[PDB]
Amino acid sequence: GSSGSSGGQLAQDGVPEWFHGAISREDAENLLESQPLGSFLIRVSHSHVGYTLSYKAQSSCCHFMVKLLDDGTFMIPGEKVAHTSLDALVTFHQQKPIEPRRELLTQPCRQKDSGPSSG
């Protein structure tokens, strides 16, 4: 691919890209579909308190549920390590895959919008 790029991450907000606030099961899968293998992302989980870590996998999009320990931390049901928050959980995931999925991460996904202002 010989596509052009800008390079760098310039934003005027206090929120990461991998954090798509609250998206729809489809939105996520669609956010990675047009993304290169490895592209990960997270979305606020409503069904069960906590979050849901997902990312593009060689085979197909993967969905991993994230519980919220009582110690104010987070740990996936099947791993042997935890993290204070998604942030500290996304970095460790870039080096260590998931119990079930031996796939690792590469870079955070970007919303399907630019984002002119908070509201």
Curated annotation (Swiss-Prot):
It is found in: Cytoplasm; Nucleus. May be phosphorylated by FES and ACK1. Predominantly expressed in spleen and hematopoietic cells such as peripheral blood leukocytes and weakly expressed in prostate, thymus, heart, small intestine and placenta. Residues 18-109 form the SH2 domain. May be a modulator of the apoptotic response through its ability to affect mitochondrial stability. Adapter protein involved in tyrosine kinase and CD28 signaling. Seems to affect CD28-mediated activation of the RE/AP element of the interleukin-2 promoter. Interacts with FES and TNK2. This is Hematopoietic SH2 domain-containing protein. It comes from Homo sapiens.
